[PDB]
Design a binder for this molecule. Structure first.
Ligand SMILES: COC(=O)c1cccc(C(=O)Nc2ncnc3nc[nH]c23)c1
Length: 118
């Protein structure tokens, strides 16, 4: 099977608008722009529950520097960010609701872009 047919710089160009769409969500992107800081947020159990943290700044730096070698690796990091927030936070919470808003934006933005890689 063929692997890594796209250049990382091709993935950067194709996928960047889906990431920019998340950054444009105000105020829903604000809890996701920087890594969760458990000390600042007073949630000392965060790293016990969330074993692989992810946030927009980490995704952005990986995409900007061509670290994604397959399109699904980017998609998996975005989903990891969402799934961590839904896992840790109460379904009734503001962060949980804001996560769901971002995931809805991402779903609408990502489907046509993945088709354009077909
Ligand atoms: C620059 O950072 C901020 O301004 C800000 C504002 C409000 C909330 C947060 C924040 O990270 N809250 C979170 N609490 C629990 N779990 C989470 N998962 C993602 N964010 C989570 C950040």
């Amino acid at each position: 099977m063929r692997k890594k047919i796209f250049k990382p710089e091709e993935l950067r160009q194709a996928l960047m608008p889906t990431l920019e769409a998340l950054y444009r969500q105000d105020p829903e992107s604000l809890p996701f722009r920087q890594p969760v800081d458990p000390q600042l947020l007073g949630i000392p159990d965060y790293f016990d529950i969330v074993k692989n943290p992810m946030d927009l700044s980490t995704i952005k730096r990986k995409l900007d520097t061509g670290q994604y070698q397959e399109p699904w690796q980017y998609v998996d990091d975005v989903w990891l960010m969402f799934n961590n927030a839904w896992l840790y936070n109460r379904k009734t919470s503001r962060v949980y609701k804001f996560c769901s808003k971002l995931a809805e934006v991402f779903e609408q933005e990502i489907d046509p872009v993945m088709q354009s890689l077909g």
